Design an enzyme around this catalytic site. Structure first.
Site, mmCIF file in Angstrom:
data_model
loop_
_atom_site.group_PDB
_atom_site.id
_atom_site.type_symbol
_atom_site.label_atom_id
_atom_site.label_comp_id
_atom_site.label_asym_id
_atom_site.label_seq_id
_atom_site.Cartn_x
_atom_site.Cartn_y
_atom_site.Cartn_z
ATOM 1 N N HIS A 36 0.879 -1.193 0.000
ATOM 2 C CA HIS A 36 0.000 0.000 0.000
ATOM 3 C C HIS A 36 0.909 1.233 0.000
ATOM 4 O O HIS A 36 0.227 2.252 -0.282
ATOM 5 C CB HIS A 36 -1.079 0.026 1.097
ATOM 6 C CG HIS A 36 -0.542 0.393 2.476
ATOM 7 N ND1 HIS A 36 -0.223 -0.511 3.477
ATOM 8 C CD2 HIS A 36 -0.327 1.623 3.016
ATOM 9 C CE1 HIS A 36 0.162 0.157 4.570
ATOM 10 N NE2 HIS A 36 0.116 1.443 4.297
ATOM 11 N N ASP A 63 -0.234 -7.379 1.074
ATOM 12 C CA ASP A 63 0.203 -5.981 1.269
ATOM 13 C C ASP A 63 1.732 -6.033 1.238
ATOM 14 O O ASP A 63 2.372 -5.977 2.313
ATOM 15 C CB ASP A 63 -0.335 -5.412 2.600
ATOM 16 C CG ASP A 63 -0.154 -3.899 2.644
ATOM 17 O OD1 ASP A 63 -0.619 -3.251 3.616
ATOM 18 O OD2 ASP A 63 0.466 -3.325 1.689
ATOM 19 N N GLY A 141 2.230 6.136 9.464
ATOM 20 C CA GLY A 141 3.628 6.391 9.064
ATOM 21 C C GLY A 141 4.502 5.176 9.292
ATOM 22 O O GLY A 141 5.565 5.056 8.638
ATOM 23 N N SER A 143 3.846 2.129 8.517
ATOM 24 C CA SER A 143 3.634 1.107 7.470
ATOM 25 C C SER A 143 4.913 0.711 6.730
ATOM 26 O O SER A 143 5.706 1.609 6.446
ATOM 27 C CB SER A 143 2.697 1.526 6.341
ATOM 28 O OG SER A 143 1.439 1.971 6.912
ATOM 29 N N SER A 159 1.513 -3.504 8.202
ATOM 30 C CA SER A 159 0.423 -3.254 7.255
ATOM 31 C C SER A 159 -0.590 -2.244 7.805
ATOM 32 O O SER A 159 -0.712 -1.186 7.146
ATOM 33 C CB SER A 159 -0.306 -4.583 6.909
ATOM 34 O OG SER A 159 -1.381 -4.281 5.969
#
Lengths: 198, 4
Positions: A36, A63, A141, A143, A159
């Site tokens: 993502h 993801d 942030g 991720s 994720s």
């Protein structure tokens, strides 16, 4: 730039994510992150300098992503822990109940335990299946950042989860947090990558 | 849940 798990990078000068793990693909240097965070060919920058571009990604469904870097980047087998570092030694998957920590640009290095595997997240974009759940807190942030055991066994990349109105799940008790990561194993095999270790 |  020195590539270390947990540090910030921006995508197409807009979004921010965190580096997961330094890896190689034959002679190509790269890092694994969340799918993502960017689309194929989006540009990644570290401290305002271009470091590489998204080479592949899958999101939603899974993801995951990898960014191929320029030759000038320095890959390190490390994950940020404050001013210190955790050495990456491999990718043995830990079981439910194991303690684990995560690193990312917003909440820093947080630890907790794995509470469930094979969890589905219903994101607005579509479902993401097969995620593992931990109760270490995280925020907007984080991720793409690293999930690792203190022994140095890399588990996956950040994720999503139940972010509260303050942008993280750090102000709710561990028992109520759902912080989800994509398993690293299928990412390495899907793209033919090898983890950098030390 | 949200991505992040």
């Amino acid at each position: 730039a020195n590539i270390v798990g947990g540090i910030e990078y921006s995508i197409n000068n807009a979004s921010l994510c965190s580096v997961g793990f330094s890896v190689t693909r034959g002679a190509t240097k790269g890092f694994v992150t969340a799918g993502h965070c960017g689309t194929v060919n989006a540009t990644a920058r570290i401290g305002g300098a271009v470091v590489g571009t998204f080479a592949a990604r899958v999101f939603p469904g899974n993801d995951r992503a990898w960014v191929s870097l320029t030759s000038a980047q320095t890959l390190l087998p490390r994950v940020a822990n404050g001013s210190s570092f955790v050495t990456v030694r491999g990718s043995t998957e830990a079981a439910v109940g194991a303690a684990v920590c995560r690193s990312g640009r917003t909440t820093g290095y947080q630890c907790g335990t794995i509470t469930a595997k094979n969890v589905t997240a219903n994101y607005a974009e579509g479902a993401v299946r097969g995620l593992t759940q931990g109760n270490a807190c995280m925020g907007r942030g984080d991720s793409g950042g690293s999930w690792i055991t203190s022994a140095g066994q890399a588990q996956g990349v950040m994720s999503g989860g139940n972010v509260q109105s303050n942008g993280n799940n750090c102000g709710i008790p561990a028992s109520q947090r759902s912080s989800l990561f994509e398993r690293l194993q299928p990412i390495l095999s899907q793209y033919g990558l090898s983890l950098v270790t030390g | 849940a949200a991505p992040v």
